[PDB]
Design an enzyme around this catalytic site. Structure first.
Site, short mmCIF file in Angstrom:
data_model
loop_
_atom_site.label_atom_id
_atom_site.label_comp_id
_atom_site.label_asym_id
_atom_site.label_seq_id
_atom_site.Cartn_x
_atom_site.Cartn_y
_atom_site.Cartn_z
N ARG A 136 -14.35 4.37 5.65
CA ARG A 136 -14.96 3.13 5.18
C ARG A 136 -15.67 2.40 6.33
O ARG A 136 -14.99 1.85 7.21
CB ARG A 136 -13.87 2.24 4.56
CG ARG A 136 -14.39 1.01 3.82
CD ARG A 136 -13.22 0.13 3.33
NE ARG A 136 -12.29 0.85 2.48
CZ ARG A 136 -11.05 1.20 2.83
NH1 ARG A 136 -10.57 0.90 4.03
NH2 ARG A 136 -10.28 1.85 1.96
N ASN B 153 -4.45 -11.42 3.15
CA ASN B 153 -5.11 -10.16 3.46
C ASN B 153 -6.07 -9.70 2.37
O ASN B 153 -5.66 -9.43 1.24
CB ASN B 153 -4.07 -9.07 3.70
CG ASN B 153 -4.71 -7.75 4.07
OD1 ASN B 153 -5.22 -7.59 5.17
ND2 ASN B 153 -4.73 -6.80 3.12
N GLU B 154 -7.36 -9.57 2.73
CA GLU B 154 -8.41 -9.08 1.83
C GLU B 154 -8.38 -9.78 0.47
O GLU B 154 -8.65 -9.18 -0.57
CB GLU B 154 -8.33 -7.55 1.66
CG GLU B 154 -8.56 -6.84 2.99
CD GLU B 154 -8.56 -5.32 2.93
OE1 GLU B 154 -8.50 -4.75 1.81
OE2 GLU B 154 -8.62 -4.70 4.01
N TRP C 58 0.24 -10.18 2.93
CA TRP C 58 -0.44 -9.48 1.83
C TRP C 58 0.01 -10.02 0.48
O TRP C 58 -0.82 -10.31 -0.39
CB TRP C 58 -0.13 -7.98 1.87
CG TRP C 58 -0.98 -7.01 2.71
CD1 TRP C 58 -1.69 -5.95 2.25
CD2 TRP C 58 -1.10 -6.97 4.15
NE1 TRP C 58 -2.27 -5.26 3.29
CE2 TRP C 58 -1.93 -5.87 4.47
CE3 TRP C 58 -0.60 -7.76 5.19
CZ2 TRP C 58 -2.26 -5.54 5.79
CZ3 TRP C 58 -0.93 -7.45 6.49
CH2 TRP C 58 -1.77 -6.34 6.78
N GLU D 267 -9.13 -5.35 11.01
CA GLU D 267 -8.54 -4.13 10.46
C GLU D 267 -9.62 -3.08 10.33
O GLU D 267 -10.67 -3.33 9.73
CB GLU D 267 -7.87 -4.37 9.09
CG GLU D 267 -6.81 -3.28 8.82
CD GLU D 267 -6.27 -3.27 7.41
OE1 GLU D 267 -5.61 -4.24 6.99
OE2 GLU D 267 -6.52 -2.26 6.71
N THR E 42 0.84 -1.21 0.00
CA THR E 42 0.00 0.00 0.00
C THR E 42 0.87 1.25 0.00
O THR E 42 0.57 2.20 -0.74
CB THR E 42 -1.00 0.09 1.16
OG1 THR E 42 -2.03 -0.89 0.97
CG2 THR E 42 -1.67 1.50 1.17
O1 LIG Z 1 -7.74 1.70 3.73
C1 LIG Z 1 -6.66 0.99 3.15
C2 LIG Z 1 -6.36 -0.25 3.92
C3 LIG Z 1 -4.74 -0.52 3.84
O2 LIG Z 1 -4.29 -0.34 2.64
C4 LIG Z 1 -4.44 -2.05 4.25
O3 LIG Z 1 -3.20 -2.39 3.70
C5 LIG Z 1 -5.57 -2.95 3.78
O4 LIG Z 1 -5.31 -4.29 4.22
C6 LIG Z 1 -5.68 -2.92 2.19
C7 LIG Z 1 -6.79 -1.81 1.96
C8 LIG Z 1 -7.13 -1.44 3.47
N1 LIG Z 1 -6.76 -2.56 4.15
#
Ligand SMILES: OC[C@@H]1[C@H](O)[C@H](O)[C@]2(O)CC[C@H]1N2
Ligand SMILES: *[C@@H]1O[C@H](CO)[C@@H](O[C@@H]2O[C@H](CO)[C@@H](O)[C@H](O)[C@H]2NC(C)=O)[C@H](O)[C@H]1NC(C)=O
Ligand SMILES: *[C@@H]1O[C@H](CO)[C@@H](O[C@@H]2O[C@H](CO)[C@@H](O)[C@H](O)[C@H]2NC(C)=O)[C@H](O)[C@H]1NC(C)=O
Ligand SMILES: *[C@@H]1O[C@H](CO)[C@@H](O[C@@H]2O[C@H](CO)[C@@H](O)[C@H](O)[C@H]2NC(C)=O)[C@H](O)[C@H]1NC(C)=O
Ligand SMILES: *[C@@H]1O[C@H](CO)[C@@H](O)[C@H](O)[C@H]1NC(C)=O
Ligand SMILES: [Ca+2]
Ligand code: NI
Length: 641
Positions: free
Chosen positions: A356, A157-158, A111, A234, A69
């Protein structure tokens, strides 16, 4: 409105702790090179008990060499047969946290993954045992080399989970004697993990916590039905102004009240990454100037303390929690030893929005709240009081003790908006304080690194924030002039989380720089096809690194050069032939001033007065044409902001 706080009809769920994430990605990048005492002071504000955020939980990225990120984070296995448990800064960070709080709970989550795990595909479920082997080696190395017990391991992750992978991970953990390590899944949405647990008894047995991201304080029926611990694994991710503090305050209470979530973990722990990278300044505090030592103990630190200093993992929520009649909420917790903590929040809609989700408007107005203590809580006659008003503001101020001596077990508070109160029997609270740190200062306009460190404390030189690829200190013994360099070490694209660039790149300096001269010695390792660059005015990084424009001076081992406006190389400023081959050191100079740039090879002009976009600004950078070995030495930048 009176609100009964009681325990005679039993307790609510067990509280599991508040924490924060270092990683996803390179969020702690600029913390490692803070001077003392500042670096240690920052760590105290985060981890020292009874001081600042006093966090119960530290979750870190298991670096996989991809962009995640705000940078990449290095893996413990760059290649097949490679193992190194001393790269990056999450080991260091976990150890510093454990030094301050030996009871801190530790979590790892990938990730990205190194490309070789995919066996030819960008997919980590091609060979389940291989991927589980990779993850388990990280947990073993944490114990063997750093004396760290990893408490929880996540999945991807996600990103999609694979039920067979989760089962293989449990089996591999047990096979290596890691029965104590618990599994949290799937670090994405409530579904499909929650229904999968109800349908598959074997999966249910091996998942210990359902962890969801950015749940908006609510859960779903299938997750309640699972009987599992539910965590906001998270959340937050909002600028750490007073509005972020309000968002954090509200969700800390209402994640449990509305969603049965017994832990919330903020992304991210500390904003130690260039602010102009994605989601800048979205940490509980700010430490993004190691050159100056300036850090900011932002409001979310004290919002954290209202909970963390007065609860611990293993307390229980009371059944008696809820919303206030006129807006806001209260939670209450005990330790089963006669202690009670009450946490009250009246965050207004306008001053508490998270990124969010964004909540539809709700009203908050002045109100009186009467609290009556029934059950085992009737016998307490004294409460310490801590108070915060967000907005000019007052943070974590201790008010005079409240007395319940009249035997009614009852008390009343006047609440306004954007306030937090903590009423607790604990006497250990402290608004920790260090003297103020140096004033903010821009990145130095003259800056050099010759990378001549024989035993570096960290695996990469300071201030270089890799945005695709991984750059490392490198010692070449069979060379005298270039014995200590900086090397790009990825030789294939990772199993990516983000849309990593097709070229590697590390950015450094001041994003506001507009006129600058960048110089660096470079060395192309791949014959015929290899290429490297230096660049200035690089305007984007992180998950947007593919979008970066600027001025990129490329040289190639086939005897050519290009000047581009974009990292992708779609837009040409200039190009031509050059006396360049592989495996030879060259000095590149790139000058950018106003509308015009020039480039030098070994101090001789290769091109000049080439027109470039203006106005424009951005970092300096180095990198390689693809995922390929190359070395860099004697870096210099002079810049005007
Ligand atoms: O709001 C951004 C967050 C951040 O970038 C983290 O890395 C994450 O796991 C990936 C998107 C969200 N959660
Ligand atoms: C999860 O939390 C919810 C509330 O967010 C609990 O729900 C019911 O909530 C209403 C009012 O909010 C109460 O009157 C009910 O008594 C609650 N249900 C029960 C069974 O007590 C819900 O119980 C929680 N689920 C758990 C703890 O598994
Ligand atoms: C509130 O919490 C404190 C802190 O845990 C409790 O005090 C400890 O009590 C245990 C036994 O229960 C002792 O072994 C520790 O030495 C105590 N430590 C401290 C710092 O006091 C306390 O009993 C709890 N209850 C009340 C009413 O204060
Ligand atoms: C970066 O360089 C440009 C180009 O030299 C500077 O722009 C010039 O500034 C002078 C005086 O400030 C003006 O007289 C010129 O007309 C400007 N030229 C153009 C093309 O705009 C710019 O000020 C420099 N910026 C910094 C921060 O040093
Ligand atoms: C909020 O509630 C108060 C009291 O009921 C009322 O006076 C005020 O107009 C309300 N504001 C909004 C925007 O609904
Ligand atoms: Ca050197
Ligand atoms: Ni900008």
């Amino acid at each position: 409105g009176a609100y009964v706080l009681d325990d005679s009809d039993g307790l609510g769920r067990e509280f599991d702790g508040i924490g924060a994430v270092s990683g996803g990605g390179a969020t702690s990048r600029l913390l490692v090179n803070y001077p003392e005492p500042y670096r240690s002071e920052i760590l105290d504000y985060l981890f020292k008990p009874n001081f600042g955020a006093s966090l119960h939980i530290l979750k870190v990225e298991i670096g996989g060499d991809g962009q995640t990120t705000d940078g990449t984070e290095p893996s413990h296995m760059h290649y097949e047969l490679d193992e190194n448990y001393f790269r990056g800064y999450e080991w260091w960070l976990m150890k510093e946290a454990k030094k301050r709080n030996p009871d801190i709970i530790l979590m790892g989550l990938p990730w990205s993954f190194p490309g070789w795990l995919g066996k030819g595909f960008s997919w980590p479920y091609v060979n389940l045992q291989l991927t589980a082997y990779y993850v388990v080696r990280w947990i073993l190395g944490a114990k063997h080399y750093h004396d760290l017990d990893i408490d929880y391991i996540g999945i991807w992750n996600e990103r999609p989970f694979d039920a067979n992978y989760i089962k293989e991970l449990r089996k591999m953990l047990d096979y290596q004697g890691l029965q104590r390590v618990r599994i949290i899944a799937s670090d994405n949405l409530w579904e499909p993990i929650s229904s999968s647990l109800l349908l598959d008894q074997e999966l249910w047995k091996v998942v210990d916590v359902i962890g969801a991201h950015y749940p908006g304080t609510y859960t779903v029926w299938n997750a309640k039905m699972s009987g599992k611990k539910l965590w906001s694994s998270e959340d937050f991710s909002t600028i750490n102004s007073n509005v972020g503090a309000g968002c954090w305050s509200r969700i800390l209470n209402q994640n449990y009240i509305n969603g049965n979530m017994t832990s919330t973990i903020a992304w991210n722990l500390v904003a130690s990454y260039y602010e102009e990278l994605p989601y800048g300044r979205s940490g509980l505090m700010t430490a993004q100037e190691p050159w100056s030592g300036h850090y900011v103990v932002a409001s979310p630190i004290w919002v954290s303390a209202h909970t963390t200093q007065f609860t611990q993992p293993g307390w229980y929520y009371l059944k008696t929690v809820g919303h206030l009649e006129k807006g806001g909420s209260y939670v209450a917790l005990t330790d089963g030893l006669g202690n009670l903590t009450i946490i009250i929040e009246t965050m207004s809609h306008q001053h508490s929005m998270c990124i969010r989700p964004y909540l539809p408007y709700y009203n908050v107005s002045h109100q009186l709240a009467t609290f009556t203590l029934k059950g085992s809580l009737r016998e307490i006659q004294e409460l310490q009081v801590w108070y915060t008003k967000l907005g000019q503001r007052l943070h974590f101020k201790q008010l005079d003790t409240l007395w319940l001596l009249d035997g009614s077990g009852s008390f009343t508070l006047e609440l306004e908006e954007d306030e937090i109160f903590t009423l607790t029997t604990l006497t250990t609270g402290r608004k920790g304080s260090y003297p103020p740190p140096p004033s903010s200062k821009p990145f130095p306009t003259n800056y050099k690194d010759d990378f001549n460190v024989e035993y570096p404390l960290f695996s990469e030189a300071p201030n270089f924030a890799d945005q695709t690829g991984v750059f490392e200190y490198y010692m070449n013994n069979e060379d005298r002039e270039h014995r200590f360099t900086l090397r790009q070490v990825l030789n294939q694209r990772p199993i990516t989380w983000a849309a990593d660039a097709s070229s590697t790149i590390s950015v450094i300096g001041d994003h506001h720089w507009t006129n600058m001269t960048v110089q660096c010695d470079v060395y192309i390792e791949t014959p015929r096809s290899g290429g490297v660059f230096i660049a200035g005015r690089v305007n984007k990084g992180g998950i947007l690194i593919r979008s970066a424009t600027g001025v990129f001076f490329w040289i190639f081992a086939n005897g050519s050069y290009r000047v581009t406006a974009d990292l992708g190389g779609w837009i040409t400023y200039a190009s031509g032939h050059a006396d360049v081959t592989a495996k030879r050191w060259y000095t590149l100079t790139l000058g950018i001033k106003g509308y015009f740039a020039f480039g030098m090879l070994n101090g001789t002009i290769l091109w000049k007065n080439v027109r470039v976009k203006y106005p424009g600004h951005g970092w300096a950078a180095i990198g390689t044409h693809t995922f390929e070995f190359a070395q860099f030495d004697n870096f210099r930048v002079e810049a005007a902001r």
